[PDB]
């Protein structure tokens, strides 16, 4: 069927695939009277090349179409398919993911629902990733982040999201879940994980997890930064895309004297 | 206990090779680091070239052996780092009085081209039991300069003390610069009585320092305020020179990832 210019092909929600030229793009249909609410984050939020813009909207009769690019891949099959991946190949992919976080942090937007399959490839190359969608993220105003809304994929969400009641640190929450990422691209498993739900909010709750033998020094202590009990421990996603991992692989009560040059690549950090 | 020249060396478990002497005539208790002989001479050459000052540590005697030397220091009564641990934080008059002390120490270290290197708390060293005079207490691994030079690569130090430029760039640094952001971490935990970067885990505690936010409380003045923040600027160049910070007013003026309703639980 036409729109304006583009073919709609079915692909069983209520997204279809859209065909112009003859370039490819997905296209999410809405009734008008809803469509304005969904697309206002994309509005608020300055184009990222980790974060999928709107393309086009067309306006018809009874209903918004919305167009996006397409993708080629989410992250949570990609490693499924591969079991664990190579830490070059982990430090690359999560380095963009983190890029899209920090970016929406910037702009006060608060993800809330991060996980594997919200990241895919934007070309056959799946070089590069991109998160796949704001439709449901929460967008804040100015410097605040509280928010109660307790929604999300079990094996990402927090400990403080379980045993708090009221609000949380949603930026918080979300690197959180950036941390069930990392250990879950480098080890292969989920941190916590269980069949039942219930049973898996147990073991989120008691916060017990073991990093195996295989990962790195700089990449155990950038999981252990991210996976802290309490919220405000956890390192922020600008200060994530700092840490000396990433160019490794490309008061206290001592005040101990170090070799600095060990944790640190000037060179590959730029 | 053993003799040295009417001096009784006496063990110091915490302390590698330095042991309290003691005079047999006077009463009096130094401090006592031994060298052997082929190296003692590098280690002392930072004391020769710098003038004595009331807040730097100077070498009371050394004593030659066959096989070592014996370089004796006045004891200090306490250290900068844990006084800050058992004060939670100084009232300004006080962080004031000490916070000279130590930039004194600094500033005519510097004037004689020796960079520091490493400065931290731990360093600075209370003289007597009053407990108001402090010294550096140590040079043995300062870097002696050559003139008005002092650029660098070593990269070693404590990591709340390190500064952004040490992180980022490859190659020198200014020392000096360098010298004056530790300061400025000085100035900012001794009145807060946290650091102004702090984690457990060191690579992530620069990756803070690497970011650069920190938050001065509302608690400090105005005049301390500006003072920690003309320090801890992120461009080396933009930072005081521990000359005028001696000069600036604060000192007078005091399978399936689907998402579900976790409300649910």
Same mark, same amino acid.
Request: aromatic content about 8%; glycine content about 4%.
């Given at each position: 069927?036409?729109?304006?210019?583009?073919?709609?092909?079915?692909?069983?929600?209520?997204?279809?695939?859209?065909?112009?030229?003859?370039?490819?793009?997905?296209?999410?249909?809405?009734?008008?009277?809803?469509?304005?609410?969904?697309?206002?984050?994309?509005?608020?939020?300055?184009?990222?090349?980790?974060?999928?813009?709107?393309?086009?909207?067309?306006?018809?009769?009874?209903?918004? #179409?919305? +167009?996006?690019?397409? /993708?080629?891949?989410?992250?949570? !099959?990609?490693? =499924?398919?591969?079991?664990?991946?190579?830490? @070059?190949?982990?430090?690359?992919?999560?380095?963009?993911?983190?890029?899209?976080?920090?970016?929406?942090?910037?702009?006060?937007?608060?993800?809330?629902?991060?996980?594997?399959?919200?990241?895919?490839?934007?070309?056959?190359?799946?070089?590069?990733?991109?998160?796949?969608?704001?439709?449901?993220?929460?967008?804040?105003?100015?410097?605040?982040?509280?928010?109660?809304?307790?929604?999300?994929?079990?094996?990402?969400?927090?400990?403080?999201?379980?045993?708090?009641?009221?609000?949380?640190?949603?930026?918080?929450?979300?690197?959180?879940?950036?941390?069930?990422?990392?250990?879950?691209?480098?080890?292969?498993? #989920?941190? +916590?994980?269980?069949? /039942?739900?219930?049973?898996?909010? !147990?073991?989120? =709750?008691?916060?017990?997890?073991?990093?195996? @033998?295989?990962?790195?020094?700089?990449?155990?202590?950038?999981?252990?930064?991210?996976?802290?009990?309490?919220?405000?421990?956890?390192?922020?996603?600008?200060?994530?895309?700092?840490?000396?991992?990433?160019?490794?692989?490309?008061?206290?009560?001592?005040?101990?004297?170090?070799?600095?040059?060990?944790?640190?690549?000037?060179?590959?950090?730029?």
């Amino acid at each position: 069927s036409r729109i304006a210019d583009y073919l709609l092909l079915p692909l069983a929600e209520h997204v279809s695939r859209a065909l112009c030229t003859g370039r490819e793009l997905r296209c999410k249909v809405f009734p008008i009277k809803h469509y304005q609410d969904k697309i206002r984050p994309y509005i608020q939020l300055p184009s990222h090349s980790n974060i999928t813009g709107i393309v086009e909207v067309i306006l018809g009769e009874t209903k918004a #179409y919305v +167009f996006f690019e397409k /993708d080629f891949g989410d992250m949570h !099959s990609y490693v =499924r398919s591969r079991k664990r991946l190579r830490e @070059e190949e982990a430090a690359r992919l999560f380095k963009q993911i983190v890029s899209a976080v920090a970016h929406c942090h910037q702009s006060a937007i608060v993800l809330g629902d991060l996980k594997l399959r919200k990241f895919v490839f934007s070309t056959e190359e799946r070089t590069q990733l991109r998160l796949e969608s704001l439709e449901d993220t929460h967008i804040m105003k100015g410097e605040d982040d509280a928010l109660s809304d307790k929604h999300g994929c079990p094996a990402y969400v927090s400990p403080e999201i379980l045993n708090t009641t009221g609000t949380y640190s949603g930026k918080a929450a979300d690197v959180w879940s950036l941390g069930v990422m990392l250990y879950t691209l480098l080890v292969g498993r #989920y941190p +916590f994980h269980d069949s /039942d739900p219930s049973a898996l909010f !147990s073991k989120i =709750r008691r916060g017990q997890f073991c990093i195996p @033998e295989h990962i790195s020094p700089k990449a155990r202590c950038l999981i252990r930064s991210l996976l802290r009990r309490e919220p405000s421990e956890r390192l922020t996603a600008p200060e994530i895309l700092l840490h000396p991992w990433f160019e490794s692989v490309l008061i206290c009560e001592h005040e101990t004297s170090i070799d600095i040059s060990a944790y640190i690549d000037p060179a590959a950090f730029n």
